[PDB]
Amino acid sequence: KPGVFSFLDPLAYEIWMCIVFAYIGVSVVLFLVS
Amino acid sequence: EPSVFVRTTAEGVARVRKSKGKYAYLLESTMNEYIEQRKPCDTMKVGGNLDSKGYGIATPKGSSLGTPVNLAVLKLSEQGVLDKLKNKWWYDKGECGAKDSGSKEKTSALS
Amino acid sequence: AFLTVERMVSPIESAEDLSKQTEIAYGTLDSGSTKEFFRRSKIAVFDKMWTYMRSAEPSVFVRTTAEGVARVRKSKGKYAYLLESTMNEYIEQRKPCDTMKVGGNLDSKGYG
Amino acid sequence: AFLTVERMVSPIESAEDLSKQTEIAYGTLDSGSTKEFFRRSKIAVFDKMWTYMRSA
Amino acid sequence: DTKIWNGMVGELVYGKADIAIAPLTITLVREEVIDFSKPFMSLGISIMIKKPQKS
Amino acid sequence: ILESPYVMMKKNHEMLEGNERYEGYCVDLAAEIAKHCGFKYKLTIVGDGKYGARDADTKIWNGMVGELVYGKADIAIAPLTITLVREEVIDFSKPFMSLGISIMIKKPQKS
Ligand SMILES: O=c1[nH]c2cc(C(F)(F)F)c(N3CCOCC3)cc2n(CP(=O)(O)O)c1=O
Ligand SMILES: O=c1[nH]c2cc(C(F)(F)F)c(N3CCOCC3)cc2n(CP(=O)(O)O)c1=O
Structure with missing residues (x-):
């Protein structure tokens, strides 16, 4: 049994870093509206 | 142009292996299938023969051996011995099993 | 599940596929050189096939080539048939164009 | 996809499974009655297997 | 039994026919009784199946 | 002629002599011919390494074909195309x- 990693496996870590950064980028845009 | 023609069959192999699907190369059917067994087994034949042809035993004209050779040929042919030896020297000697390599392809991961 | 199971299915392109299955009955004319080929055959695949047809019931053999064509057309893909290649191509062009040859020839013969 | 590919795989339970595959190598002692059994073999499966080892 | 050829084969062996032009399969047994041309x-042998139309 | 897999040298072909030197599809075939037609045989490579094209100048077949025209070869057993131009001078058996002709392509591998 893998620990933690098995959940991580279906989608690559890089893709995670990307979705994180992308979300952070989306996040500020709402503030621009304010 | 540049000409599709190539100096050697080996040259055609070199192009097709480099072609990456950009190019296709005609050649003798049995030779093609013989390449199919060969590594890296990247090659594959497609379609039926464009035209019928058949290699045959040749004898000097008027040779006494002629007819017996002929009967021997048909006899060996009907026994399936020829097909047996074909299966031998081609597929059985094959560097890459076709359905063997086909059974072996189950990966994963994510782009 | 539907699309998955659907994609797993593959069309036959070699007689060996019949040896690997049983869902689709297959056979030749009740008499002729063709059956005698399998009967005399020593290749394991064809031998398995002849061994199969000899045992399978109701027998796959049919009285006439036309009867075999009808047994194929009405079986809705559950009964393949085997016959001379040129004959097969000549039938495939015929109406209702509902049937087709598949795969390479199992063996060599030549009219002369 | 992972779970599906996971379930498709099955443990070997007949030598025929080896004949139907190639990914896992298989063989016998370099000499002995066992090898003789395959070279003398006439059963199509074992014949296929010995034919395989013969050239692999 | 009678060891008598019938059909076109007989027609050639028995001189009834001058030449045969037909989808006549070559066979070793027929090879020794009459002379074939090159094929x-x-x-x-070939596989006939239902055509898989979608609906 | 030297054509894989119809004719191939032994790994120790240098260590070997005679019919032992050769192995291939045509080898097994010719061996069967020796079986049925009943005779001793000794395989020999064609000297020019050619099938035996007819010169349009000297009007002379070379190769195995010239070997047949000149009796240098008792019989021919090679992957040799049968043609009307060749049949007239020498007697091919039933093929x-x-x-x-067939289409060769690399097997597709898109991503
Ligand atoms: O020389 C031979 N040439 C043959 C040519 C054909 C055809 F294909 F029609 F041209 C056929 N048929 C197959 C299709 O159904 C109608 C008859 C049988 C032939 N047979 C008898 P076999 O022993 O059953 O092969 C021969 O002996
Ligand atoms: O009788 C003939 N028999 C032949 C047999 C073969 C082979 F397949 F290797 F056995 C080949 N090759 C095809 C593969 O690449 C290497 C040479 C050429 C042949 N040619 C020349 P063609 O005049 O271009 O047909 C003949 O004449």
């Missing part, structure tokens, strides 16, 4:  | 293997 149409 |  003019390669052919063999 | 042992139907074949034709």
Whole structure:
């Protein structure tokens, strides 16, 4: 049994870093509206 | 142009292996299938023969051996011995099993 | 599940596929050189096939080539048939164009 | 996809499974009655297997 | 039994026919009784199936 | 002629002599010919390494074909195309293997 990693496996870590950064980028845009 | 023609069959192999699907190369059917067994087994034949042809035993004209050779040929042919030896020297000697390599392809991961 | 199971299915392109299955009955004319080929055959695949047809019931053999064509057309893909290649191509062009040859020839013969 | 590919795989339970595959190598002692059994073999499966080892 | 050829084969052996032009399969047994020309149409056993139309 | 897999040298072909030197499809075939037609045989490579084209100048077949025209070869057993231009000078048997022009491509691997 893998620990933690098995959940991580279906989608690559890089893709995670990307979705994180992308979300952070989306996040500020709402503030621009304010 | 540049000409599709190539100096050697080996040259055609070199192009097709480099072609990456950009190019296709005609050649003798049995030779093609013989390449199919060969590594890296990247090659594959497609379609039926464009035209019928058949290699045959040749004898000097008027040779006494002629007819017996002929009967021997048909006899060996009907026994399936020829097909047996074909299966031998081609597929059985094959560097890459076709359905063997086909059974072996189950990966994963994510782009 | 539907699309998955659907994609797993593959069309036959070699007689060996019949040896690997049983869902689709297959056979030749009740008499002729063709059956005698399998009967005399020593290749394991064809031998398995002849061994199969000899045992399978109701027998796959049919009285006439036309009867075999009808047994194929009405079986809705559950009964393949085997016959001379040129004959097969000549039938495939015929109406209702509902049937087709598949795969390479199992063996060599030549009219002369 | 992972779970599906996971379930498709099955443990070997007949030598025929080896004949139907190639990914896992298989063989016998370099000499002995066992090898003789395959070279003398006439059963199509074992014949296929010995034919395989013969050239692999 | 009678060891008598029938059909076109008999027609050649018995001189009834001058030449045969037909989808006549070459066979070793027929090879020894009459003389074939070189084959003019390669052919063999083949698989006929239902055409898989979508609906 | 030297054509894989119809004719191939032994790994120790240098260590070997005679019929032992050769192995291939045509080897097994010719061996069967020796079986049925009953005779001793000794395989020999054609000297020019050619099938035996007819010169249009000297009007002379070379190769195995010239070997037949000049009796240098008792019989021919090679992957040799049968043609009307060749049949007139030498006697081909009924062909042992139907074949034709075929399409070679690398097997697709898109991503
Ligand atoms: O020389 C031979 N040439 C043959 C040519 C054909 C055809 F294909 F029609 F041209 C056929 N048929 C197959 C299709 O159904 C109608 C009859 C049988 C032939 N047979 C008898 P076999 O022993 O059953 O092969 C021969 O002996
Ligand atoms: O009788 C003939 N028999 C032949 C047999 C073969 C082979 F397949 F290797 F056995 C080949 N090759 C095809 C593969 O690349 C290497 C040479 C050429 C042949 N040619 C020359 P063609 O005049 O271009 O047909 C003949 O004449």
